[PDB]
């Protein structure tokens, strides 16, 4: 399992603003939205096999190859 560190050395991510819309577009009604958020809150504090398998399913094979090549280039630069 992967867990977050302490005293971060980088804070330059500056992610994009979250999209906001009616409750219907995301997990149906408002009551349903809270339940799902609580359910998935246990996966936020760590990264493990469940995250990797979902990535494999979503990325197929092209995503894996491009990610591997980019990681190799990153290692080469470092």
């Amino acid at each position: 399992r992967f867990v977050r560190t302490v005293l971060p050395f980088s804070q330059e991510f500056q992610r994009d603003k979250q999209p906001n819309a009616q409750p219907q577009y995301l997990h149906g009604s408002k009551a349903l939205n809270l339940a799902y958020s609580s359910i998935y809150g246990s996966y936020r504090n760590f990264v493990g096999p469940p995250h990797f398998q979902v990535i494999c399913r979503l990325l197929g094979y092209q995503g894996i190859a491009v990610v591997m090549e980019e990681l190799l280039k990153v290692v080469k630069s470092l």
């Binding site: 094979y61 092209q62 894996i64 190859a65 491009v66 090549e69």
Partner: protein, 49 residues
């Protein structure tokens, strides 16, 4: 083809847990013989008496 560029074969094979030879080691019967001192003469610069 894209994931295949970075892929190599696996040197994995299957063999049985125990493998025996085609011919086993049969026992050899014992024969009593006297001490002979004329068996090392044929090797090296031996002496015949």
């Amino acid at each position: 083809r894209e994931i295949g560029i970075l892929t190599t074969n696996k040197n994995t094979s299957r063999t049985h847990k125990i493998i025996a030879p085609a011919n086993l080691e049969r026992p050899v019967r014992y024969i009593r013989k006297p001490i002979d001192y004329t068996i090392l003469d044929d090797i090296g610069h031996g002496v015949k008496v």
